[PDB]
């Protein structure tokens, strides 16, 4: 009775209804990599990051390095997204290799909390800046529909780690 | 047992795993609206469209207006995406308001198949062209990463309908 | 007798009159560099009127023009903007390809890039802008002009011939 | 003997040497129109303006309405160009459809001197903002290699005329 299309369709419906609250509607989603240098071990390893955008919130979810699972998750209201900075990666040595985007957010009435992300670039000689500008512009345009401005600022990224990230529902 | 946070994270990883085939990775996804005049009824109601991009394919899902679920679903290999056109909407009379994005694809080795999409915008004084240029750009580099090319063309859009779309897994 | 100023204004008047035919208005002009390999930067002057565009190549060691073309906007088929068709490794910068009909034949094109001071600068925005003026100028006078973003082909244009 | 192409070649050569000082190289040039109410001849028309850019200077020339003749000529050093404002034309009433470009220059250590220009080309449909943005971006990129930075502000333009312009060599 039920066809492949009907099954994959019903799966899509159910999962838009499970991921987001009833009042929220999907706008955009991007696969990204964590750009902040972590304080763990030597071997350089890409941390997958998922950024999802609705009409009223943006979602940041971090993936475990080796296995397929989510280590850290956050639903963040758009009003608390203060500013976006886009510029050369804050490496601890060498020339910056690519661009990263830093999303600065308000948490428990405080600043110093930020996510620094870059796009998955399969071409080594590709900057990645265009992709991040596009993402920032959609975050901006969406926040503006709520009635609030969001500055997108081009500048060199400060080599600093943002206040410990806590999980948020 | 598991916390509220643990369940949400689990649902998320499971979703991203089910959404695409084993070998594919998610790159990006966007909520859009069908831009071409559809021939069931000639009225004023937006047809919602979901566009997903993997490393090897893009996915187009049309939603029923009455209910929040699919009416049509297509997985389309990136090899078959011929070109993208971006210009003013093909209005049957008078001034075109917004820009639309036309994705020309090859189906059963035949051409003349296309999706015409636009962005959902909360500012009537914004043509949405930048949002569409961004999406086209990600489709372009993704295809360039797999070895081929994808022309993005700025021109006027022609006042013709696409060949009927068929569901494809 | 005339002043320094009066002479300067008269020179400018005379120049804009001499630059183009009686029935043409100047719209825009840009200093560019040849992007294609030749069979040392070659300076290129591109000029735009209401009905035509002008391409003039400069010799590499002397201040002189050695190739000059007036091309009607109706003969400009399409514009391609994308990374330079290099013969080695990574393309440094974007180039703009102006495809034109010459005596009812295709395969003729100029590949040009912007004069860019900062080495960490693509120069794509500058070229997008030039193409946008060529587009609207042609559209007001005649047919539409496609601007295509893609990777440029590693082919060489059909030999350029001079047009008055 | 000398061919036609040879003659136009030496005409182009000598004249790009007569217009500019010996150490100045032509970057760009645009035909524009005065947005501001004329002060020399009060009545409303479309005063032709030529804007030329070299590596160290920009040139502004006002043509006479009836006969083609330079009524006002200014060579202005890029260092004295402090800001560029873009946005709707300054009217006394109602809706401004097209946008203008206001270049503020410092003259004899004093401010309040500006040129308000708009693009010649357009459809009544388009505001002409994109063109002026491109010009602004060439003036910015040129001055910056040479000197101090140049901000481009998007804002409403008062229609406040700018201190009487004096001819400069």
From Swiss-Prot, chain C:
Transmembrane segments: none annotated. Residues 2-164 form the hSac2 domain. Ubiquitous. Highly expressed in brain. It is found in: Membrane, Clathrin-coated pit; Early endosome; Recycling endosome. It comes from the Eukaryota. Inositol 4-phosphatase which mainly acts on phosphatidylinositol 4-phosphate. May be functionally linked to OCRL, which converts phosphatidylinositol 4,5-bisphosphate to phosphatidylinositol, for a sequential dephosphorylation of phosphatidylinositol 4,5-bisphosphate at the 5 and 4 position of inositol, thus playing an important role in the endocytic recycling. Regulator of TF:TFRC and integrins recycling pathway, is also involved in cell migration mechanisms. Modulates AKT/GSK3B pathway by decreasing AKT and GSK3B phosphorylation. Homodimer. Interacts with OCRL and RAB5A. Interacts with INPP5B and INPP4A. Interacts with STAT3; the interaction is independent of STAT3 'Tyr-705' phosphorylation status. This is Phosphatidylinositide phosphatase SAC2. It comes from Homo sapiens. The gene is INPP5F. The chain holds residues 593 to 760 of 1132 of the full protein.
